[PDB]
Design a protein around this ligand. Structure first.
Ligand SMILES: [Cl-]
Ligand SMILES: [Cl-]
Length: 117
């Protein structure tokens, strides 16, 4: 099960990035999917989730700024990240986000996000 992340970058505070998570339709269409992130000195944390039925939920810290979505084909999960803050700096990873099981038993390489002057 490949999880292929892209869309990171280095931006100024107030900037934007769009992350993409490419995976098999068998995974993305049948499971809740999430975007997670991990900064130096901190644990990995879930910041956005989209249920298999399309219901979105967000960490308080990103509400109103980040939007998670699926594409038509259900082969990419996007994270639009607007109004970026220094505190958003982290490596971002996608995975399943089951309410019962959490993520899959492995992780992709992630995509790097740095928000800095
Ligand atoms: Cl920028
Ligand atoms: Cl990267």
């Amino acid at each position: 099960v490949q999880l292929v992340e892209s869309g990171g970058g280095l931006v100024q505070p107030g900037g934007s990035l769009r992350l993409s998570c490419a995976a098999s339709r068998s995974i993305i269409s049948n499971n809740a999917m999430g975007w997670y992130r991990q900064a130096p000195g901190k644990q990995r944390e879930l910041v956005a989730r989209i249920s298999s039925g399309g219901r979105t939920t967000y960490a308080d810290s990103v509400k109103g700024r980040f939007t998670i979505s699926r594409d038509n084909a259900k082969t990419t999960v996007y994270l639009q990240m607007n109004s970026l803050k220094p505190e958003d700096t982290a490596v971002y990873y996608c995975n399943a986000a089951s309410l019962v099981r959490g993520p899959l038993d492995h992780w992709g390489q992630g995509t790097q996000v740095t928000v800095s002057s």
